[PDB]
Design a protein around this ligand. Structure first.
Ligand SMILES: Cc1ccc(NS(=O)(=O)c2c(C(=O)N3CCCCCC3)c(C)n(C)c2C)c(Cl)c1
Lengths: 357, 357
């Protein structure tokens, strides 16, 4: 049979200078386990690659260096804008193959996110902890680890999609085995963007909005910002698709929504008006907003204590229209309950003060 | 052949205590002309009916009283909530047939607006000047008069739709002759709501949003409010469909938009957040907002100096989802240019101060 939850367990980074405590697997322990149990390959993908920035990030880079010398095919995908440290990486690991990826060469807007590991088509990690020393040591992250072969194999097919966009000289099946119409143990992957989706994969933009509109009781979102206007290039881009489905739940359906976003800029007139209007919604409706100032890459979504959505991208226009990433989705009640515990901890954390304007 | 503009001319009410001046036909002159030239019937429809509130409104009620005594079938449609003056009306005009209409007996939300006259299938008026003494004398209104038989006949078919919903005891073809796909002289009627639209008529909600998204240069709107949340019954109703298409034009397409809305309530947390965010958009984009405090029923929309939309309803959720009304639409360059002159006059009027918060 198929195990419930697809052998998935929560993984996150809790720095020492932060009051976050949990019994889940740490990101440092997760990456070290993938390298130790590696017998065939290690495929890593993220935007920026800079493990040598912290102590724990350098140890993971050393275990990965020893793996490539033992005969393990290690491929690291990184967007061509995180190419600043490329000369530093190849000088330390001549065996690890580093590949610069530009998924959007037509307009140069789409960035490579992804943020996932996969090894031997058995073990894998999916979260917002990039291959940087910060995400492993000093920055709060969140993700899921799974040693289930059928699930990690479906994630490796996502790696084959992004690998084809290497910036070198000159067929892609865009294959998937599980989606919202056929999950594996109550777990499936949503993908992005739409022009790289193919015909079988599920667009993460549609799946998130569908779960936001199908909400019945609670909506818990811990992202960096929900400001529906993000500045692409040097101009403003208005995209309230996710921002509307949330307020539609709080006003029309009376959903108790708690948003934990990062602190906004005092000079950004766009983030100012977004915040002052969320302040007015907390008075009339059951909306609650708290802000944080720490370095946190967590992108969490929980609906009705029944569905969970952990991703590396942020709920905004720039990400869900151009950026390419893989998002974790699960409806397993036992796995969602563990994610609910994480949001309750962060909501009352000392680093989460109530929104004041 | 067919005349350009479909024999349409602008009609409005400019009270003496207001600095509004124009050479167009007045509403008092318009209603008096329809009654004088009446030879068969006079069909009137509006929400509230109270002509005896002002002097000019009483004169129109006297000319209409003399018409019913001369042998003219006069039918007055009014929503069952404007029924307070019904006993006062029938006591003064026993020949005029007054009919109470409730277009929404399932949920009791949809109100009868319409706000139009039609006589002999030749002359007609379409605007926001209800059959009240205020709309004729003391309240600024706006509308269009046309003695073109093919156009007034298409408006009378709208009267046959609302007349069928009389609250008395117990087939409706919902016929139309002209729409956006087949205008008459560059003029057509959009209708509302959707459950009374039939299969041939055009929903005003779709036509307005289509013209708002197809804007290329300018958007001029003079309505009562653009607050995307209106309180139905005793609860809040979130509906940003029109509010999104406007901001999508100003931010994504850089459309110079000038909104002339009424003053908002200091205690309405919903209108407060709506205003403070329009204030932030005027700083970054080319948006301009001015507010008025006078009694004004004008509902005007001008796009690219090429399309005009005069209606009796307001751009909000309660109206374009339940209320039943008929809206005037025209693409005639000569008629739109005259409407542009009206908006420019109102934008710099003494009753239109810049939005301040
Ligand atoms: C960057 C930026 C700049 C301005 C705004 N403006 S806005 O007022 O905050 C707003 C809201 C909004 O939150 N309210 C709250 C109060 C009542 C419910 C309607 C209005 C919505 C739903 N939309 C579609 C907009 C545009 C925004 Cl959202 C973002």
């Amino acid at each position: 049979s198929v195990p419930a939850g697809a052998k998935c367990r929560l993984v996150e980074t809790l720095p020492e200078n932060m009051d976050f405590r949990s019994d889940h697997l740490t990101t440092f322990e997760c990456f070290n386990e993938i390298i130790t149990l590696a017998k065939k390959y290690i495929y890593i993908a993220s935007f920026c690659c800079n493990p040598l920035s912290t102590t724990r990030g350098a140890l993971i880079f050393d275990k990965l260096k020893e793996a490539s010398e033992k005969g393990i095919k290690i491929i690291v995908l990184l967007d061509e804008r995180g190419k600043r440290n490329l000369g530093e990486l190849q000088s330390h690991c001549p065996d690890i193959n580093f590949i610069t990826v530009n998924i959007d060469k037509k307009n140069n807007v789409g960035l490579l996110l992804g943020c996932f590991w996969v090894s031997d088509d058995e073990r894998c990690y999916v979260g917002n902890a990039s291959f940087t020393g910060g995400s492993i040591h000093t920055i709060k992250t969140l993700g899921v680890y799974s040693d289930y072969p059928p699930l990690a194999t479906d994630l490796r097919r996502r790696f084959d999609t992004f690998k084809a966009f290497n910036s070198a000289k000159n067929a892609l099946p865009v294959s998937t085995a599980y989606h919202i119409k056929n999950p594996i143990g109550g777990v499936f992957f949503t993908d992005s963007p739409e022009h790289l989706l193919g015909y079988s994969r599920d667009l993460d933009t549609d799946v998130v909005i569908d779960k936001l509109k199908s909400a019945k009781t609670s909506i818990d979102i811990e992202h960096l910002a929900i400001v529906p206007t993000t500045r692409v290039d040097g101009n403003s881009y208005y995209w309230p698709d996710i921002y509307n489905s949330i307020i539609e739940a709080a006003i029309n359906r009376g959903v108790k929504i708690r948003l934990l976003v990062g602190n906004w800029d005092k000079n950004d007139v766009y983030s100012m008006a977004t915040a002052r209007s969320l302040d007015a919604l907390c008075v009339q409706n059951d909306l609650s907003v708290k802000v944080f100032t720490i370095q946190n890459n967590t992108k969490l979504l929980i609906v009705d204590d029944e569905y969970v959505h952990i991703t590396s991208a942020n709920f905004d226009g720039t990400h869900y229209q151009n950026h390419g990433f893989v998002s974790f989705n699960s409806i397993d009640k036992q796995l969602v309950s563990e994610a609910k515990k994480i949001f309750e901890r962060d909501w009352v954390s000392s680093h989460s003060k109530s929104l004041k304007i």
